[PDB]
Amino acid sequence: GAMGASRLYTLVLVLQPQRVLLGMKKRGFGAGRWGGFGGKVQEGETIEDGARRELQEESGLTVDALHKVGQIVFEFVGEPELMDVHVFCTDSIQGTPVESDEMRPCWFQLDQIPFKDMWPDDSYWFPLLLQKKKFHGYFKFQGQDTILDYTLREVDTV
């Protein structure tokens, strides 16, 4: 049948030449895991403006520009609505990261990416982001730990 309907999300990775900024989610879905900054796109809001807003809300940072790097669709067994996640990166940040209600930030050196405490899917697509390759992916999860199916492809244009 038809693909499930999806909710539009953004995900932002602050990626500098030697380090990446990650936030530990403090509560709720995905609590305890390190990852990028993001959330739901709002009505009338462009995707990139939503990405800027979520980054500012969750880390306090503003950015000059955001670069589109990928798109990932997430499906969770038992929930028919998908997450349609537009992934961005930036390397020019203004301000300092601050702990928010949602996220506790730390910088990680790029030879210390904490995959064991990140979402399982990050092990597959984060290496492509680091190579400056654009990608489309899909991950079907049972709960928060188990991947039942995934697809991933490098693309020329996100």
Ligand X SMILES: Nc1nccc(-c2ccccc2)n1
Residue 126 near ligand X by CB under 6 A:
no
Quick one: which of 85, 113, 128, 129 contacts ligand X (CB under 6 A)?
85
Number of chain positions touching ligand X (CB under 6 A)? 16
Of 75 and 97, the one with the shorter C-beta distance to ligand X is 75
Residues 6+ apart with CB under 8 A from 79: none
Quick one: which of 119, 135, 137, 150 contacts ligand X (CB under 6 A)?
119
Residue 83 near ligand X by CB under 6 A:
yes
**Is the CA virtual torsion 143, 147, 151, 155 positive or negative?**
positive
105 forms beta bridges with 23
Quick one: which of 62, 79, 117, 142 contacts ligand X (CB under 6 A)?
79
Quick one: which of 16, 56, 76, 99 contacts ligand X (CB under 6 A)?
76
Q: For residue 134, what are its two tokens?
A: 């654009």
Q: For residue 2, what are its two tokens?
A: 């038809």
**What residues between 33 and 62 interact with ligand X by CB under 6 A?**
35, 38
Query: What whole-number distance in Å separates Cα of residue 135 and Cα of residue 30?
Result: 23
Secondary structure element (H or E) that encloses residue 93, with its range: strand 93-94
Region of 17 (left: φ > 0; alpha: ψ -120 to 50; beta: rest) is alpha
Of 88 and 97, the one with the shorter C-beta distance to ligand X is 88
Q: For residue 38, what are its two tokens?
A: 């993001």
Residues interacting with ligand X, by CB under 6 A? Answer: 7, 9, 11, 29, 35, 38, 74, 76, 79, 81-83, 85, 119, 121-122
